[PDB]
Amino acid sequence: DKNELVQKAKLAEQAERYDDMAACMKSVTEQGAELSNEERNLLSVAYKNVVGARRSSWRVVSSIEQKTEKKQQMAREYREKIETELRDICNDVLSLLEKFLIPNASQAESKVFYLKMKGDYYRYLAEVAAGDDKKGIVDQSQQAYQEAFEISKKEMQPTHPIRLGLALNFSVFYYEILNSPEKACSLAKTAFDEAIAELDTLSEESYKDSTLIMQLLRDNLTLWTS
């Protein structure tokens, strides 16, 4: 069935174990119907934590790799052991976001988030590669936001959380990955201020996500300016 996959996803979410849900949700992407918003963030959170679990795995081991000769090799081999795991899972979802749900869709904002994920996960793969191995991915990611970002500044109000979500993520995309703070600074201030003048109507679309990301812009800028 379909709701049994959906229901099991929620139950797996309960018990701190999302790897089980990710394999259950990865099947949901491979169904063929129209994904809906409520479980859409379940798709977002599922691989984000699954990758984040491996991201946190890679980020710490990278530290001790540089904090060091056979012992260095142990770190060197293990680090690549998880990067392949980190890359394979990202390629698993990059296949999801490419051939499965982008084609079938009819609401611009629904397309905005998935395109954000396409830029997201390609960017995630871009964190591990080096030199030539990432240029084909980074360029693919940049287009995923640029396609969505142009839909952002045009087709949706600045109050909606995803546009700020597309804004904060896209901005940091410039600072760390692309190493272009000037476009990040300009976009961050623009996205935040164009969204600070229309904060009158919040409760109709949860105020929670707004102020977090809104705050997450200024403090990030506080770091991005120092």
Partner: protein, 409 residues
Amino acid sequence: IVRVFLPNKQRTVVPARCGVTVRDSLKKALMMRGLIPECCAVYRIQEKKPIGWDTDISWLTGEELHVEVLHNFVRKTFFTLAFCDFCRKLLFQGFRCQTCGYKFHQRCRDRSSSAPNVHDWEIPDGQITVGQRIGSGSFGTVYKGKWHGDVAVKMLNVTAPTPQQLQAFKNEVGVLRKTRHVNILLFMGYSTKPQLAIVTQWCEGSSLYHHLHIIETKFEMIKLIDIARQTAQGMDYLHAKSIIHRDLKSNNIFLHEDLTVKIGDFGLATVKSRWSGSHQFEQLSGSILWMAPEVIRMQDKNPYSFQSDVYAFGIVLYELMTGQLPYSNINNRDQIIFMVGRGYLSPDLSKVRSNCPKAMKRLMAECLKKKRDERPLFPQILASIELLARSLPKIHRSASEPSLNRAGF
């Protein structure tokens, strides 16, 4: 021999020989209630020179000791939303503990952040059916009546009109009109031509103070967290538009038949500190239990500066996790004012219930901290609760076997 003024309203005679220092002599008696020479502090009378733990007690015979209270770091990756607890930013990785519940900072390069996951009113006379007044309270008098149904009118104390003061209300009522929310009561309107009987919605259900001391009925503590969350969220939205409650009490709070809490009967900092001109310099009112130490001092020109309501929330947490008010042993209104504002007295936290998580007992260590510079704004206080509102089936056992520190300083 030396004395000890233990928390939890206790005192125990203890010996003190020669040679042995502060640490062991007291620790042999400190431990029986769950202390340690590195989580407590005592002072001597000189006026409080800090007497530490290494010092020798050969010159401390016939002395008095007020033992006033001042982790192991496992790792994790916070799947749900969870904020830091050293700078109150957003936290993804980092340390923790199995008992305390307190996150810790990790950069003290410094990686950036990302997007966290998710899931006018004119009223003329004619429909004003005012009944018996309930009673006094924080800023004045309240009237149960009828306006478009069972809706609570509210007549202020100083109803003396001022043509500019109505404009001030238009400044304070327009802001406090459209802010609807799941918890906050749906405000209706204001009595215009008759004296101001504010049309705020009335319903059924028992109050919180009514639910704990007039009847004094408690439940399973799973519902206790529900109260400390929704009131953290309902009053969070009020600080989302800077609209301070200014009168948070266990009285006005409602309960919607074990479904959800409801907060209301708030605001109007204009009638409070009434216009004696064009000024609205403030004053204390009601009782000083909910109200904050830096509002007691009478020197806070803007007392509700986004943190004096945090302390008011904590005085609701203490009423939630103790079944009793603060200071049931000191029962004089005028004198408790002197000893709370200057910092001589803080609520005795070592009497809280025994079957509550250490994390919320840490929440009261900050949500009731006398200073206003390290109160966690309701953004952080809101998020913390869902962390240990879904973490009930995880630490419900008896303090079993924990691991080692797993972290090196």
